[PDB]
Design a protein around this nucleic acid. Sequence first.
DNA 1: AAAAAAAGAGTTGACACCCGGGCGAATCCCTGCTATAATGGGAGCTGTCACGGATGC
Length: 40
Amino acid sequence: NPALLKKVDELELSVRSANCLKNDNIVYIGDLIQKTEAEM
DNA sequence: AAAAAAAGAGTTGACACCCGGGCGAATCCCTGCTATAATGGGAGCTGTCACGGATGC
């Protein structure tokens, strides 16, 4: 799917979500969608 | 099963500034006054008709 090319901070869900995503060092949505509940 | 904080709000002083209103100064517009003698004017058709009307005796 072409949606994976978009960055993780391209949806602006919330401030805490952006903070934890930046702390996790994620650039693509695939690494976040793969981890369902373990890494979350 | 409990219990406090980055944001989210809410302000509180602390500059940075940006046209406005005066203070100047430098400079525009008006108006009148000049003392020998000045003394009637320059284009323009004029190589279309024909009609339809307005004056005159």
